[PDB]
Amino acid sequence: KGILSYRGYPLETLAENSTFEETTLLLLDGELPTKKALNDFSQQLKDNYRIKYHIRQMMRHFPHTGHPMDMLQTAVSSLGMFYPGTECLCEDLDYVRNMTVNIIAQMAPLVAMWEHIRNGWDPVNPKHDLSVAENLLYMFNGEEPDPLMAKIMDVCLILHAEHTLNASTFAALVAGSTLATPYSVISAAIGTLSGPLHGGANQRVVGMLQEIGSPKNVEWGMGHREYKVKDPRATILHKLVEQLVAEFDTALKLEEVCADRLGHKGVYPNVDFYSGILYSEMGIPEDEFTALFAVARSAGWLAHWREQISDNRIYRPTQIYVGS
Amino acid sequence: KGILSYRGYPLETLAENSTFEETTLLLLDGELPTKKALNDFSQQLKDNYRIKYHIRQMMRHFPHTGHPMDMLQTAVSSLGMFYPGTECLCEDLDYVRNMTVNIIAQMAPLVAMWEHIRNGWDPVNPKHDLSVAENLLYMFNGEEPDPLMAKIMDVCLILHAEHTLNASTFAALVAGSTLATPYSVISAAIGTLSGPLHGGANQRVVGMLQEIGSPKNVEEYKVKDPRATILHKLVEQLVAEDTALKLEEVCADYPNVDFYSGILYSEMGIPEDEFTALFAVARSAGWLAHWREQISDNRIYRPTQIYVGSD
């Protein structure tokens, strides 16, 4: 139950008085950023939101049916070609950090670009005076959102920013273990997250019910390997959903599902339990729910990628399978 | 301990009496296939060799400076946006195997397309009749290679087909644990191998203009790799019917198969940039092989480690 394991800071406290940019820095650097440092970080991130025309071109070339996560993984792998380099150490610039900020910055714009392109329309460019959360809602809705909605998105980004050693980060670590480009490792993490077992947030959006949970019983997979208790992020998302709806059928149904805790004594609501409801309530399409999660986890992935300074570990495991 | 361990068949047994197609089926199914099964798998492979026009158009817009491995990863992930679905186990078809053959069949063709497009020239489309190995040399060289080189290439493929749990293979498994599109998982595998630590035959094949001397000073099989010995024999055979010599000199020390992986490819005419890629065309079979058994008994890989920080 290592709850609030964020660079030695409680997630609830970070939920306020903190931003995705500030939280991202905290994870990347390890300590709360100074005003100057945070200002420089945000500005660099803002001037990295730009997307190469080549990326938008390939996006149009591919079909609309394509899932956003697959496009995100493909785009990130492609981004590596534009900013290549091997940290074998020769070194042209500061590959670490410089590439990371460029990636984190383009993540949101890339997601929005695919949304409009797949809908047969031109992408909404991000604003250098808009934060990641601000750009997300602004680009998706085509109009800058009210501060509350932007704040809600920022809280979500902070919640999905990092979580101990999940499969997505684990894959990123193994990828980084080979001293591969950050773009390549992020591509691997995106696919690992894409999996429903890791990113089944949309898989929990299939309520297919109306306050009839008891009949719908065993004999979407509520529970977590480490969260032997309800996920704190889930509770935060729940209150966020309550505030938004206050200002709903799925919310009632999902609350009833959690209410049937009698059935589950070990497993309990996961973060994905209410994540989709809030995103849908914010207008985000179900297809992108997991994609938004990738935008936040990008910070944690790159933070662990930086923690791979001791890359002596090639991450090669031991064979135990029966080689008959 | 893991030397020559392909489904219990010593790699040497596959060295001959076996082809990457049979070896791949052997690894995937676990038992040497019957004539019918091999023929069907071969025909299905020779059927998915084709590449969607969307992929090439995308490659054309991309820059020549692009590294083959980076493009390969991008391409594999992209292909996942044509053959789609999720295994809730509703599936529109037999996702497993069907996608598996598609990925393996399109691996080499994609690599070759990049080589030509990278050089601003139209790609060499594959031939249904030719084998994966035969098509490979045909696409890169631009003409039918001698059965000799083809046989050698097929052999090299079997050697790099499967290697226990290499970082790339393990990465494929971790992603599979998440039940993710085979394309996404394999693309990730392509990322891991891209790492010089996992795959750096191109880095090794090149020397610092060594003056045929031993001044170099200091600053997992511990004995010579078995596949290395196989390449060593092929190396002497090829030169029998210069650059390798210095490597034979360094054979005095040799440990890794990579030691000679590039030279052979070089004689076949393969550019250095494509060395790591060729390896992927082979390790693909293994990655997909492990993925199948994983999805059979799959549990999301969720490890844990302590970290100082307090609160």
Automatic annotation (TrEMBL), chain A:
Q: Active site annotated at which positions?
A: H224, D272
**The keyword Transferase is annotated on this UniProt entry:** yes
**Which keywords describe this protein according to UniProt?**
Transferase, Tricarboxylic acid cycle
| InterPro entries referenced in this protein's UniProt entry, alphabetically | 2-MeCitrate/Citrate_synth_II, Citrate_synth-like_lrg_a-sub, Citrate_synth-like_sm_a-sub, Citrate_synthase, Citrate_synthase_bac-typ, Citrate_synthase_sf
- BP term (GO), one: carbohydrate metabolic process
Q: Which reaction does it catalyse?
A: oxaloacetate + acetyl-CoA + H2O = citrate + CoA + H(+)
What cellular component terms from Gene Ontology apply here?
A: cytosol
Citing just one GO molecular function, the answer is: citrate synthase activity
Write down the PANTHER family for this protein, in alphabetical order. Answer: CITRATE SYNTHASE, CITRATE SYNTHASE, PEROXISOMAL
Family membership noted in the UniProt record: Belongs to the citrate synthase family.
Name of the featured protein: Citrate synthase
Q: Which organism is it from?
A: Methylophaga sulfidovorans
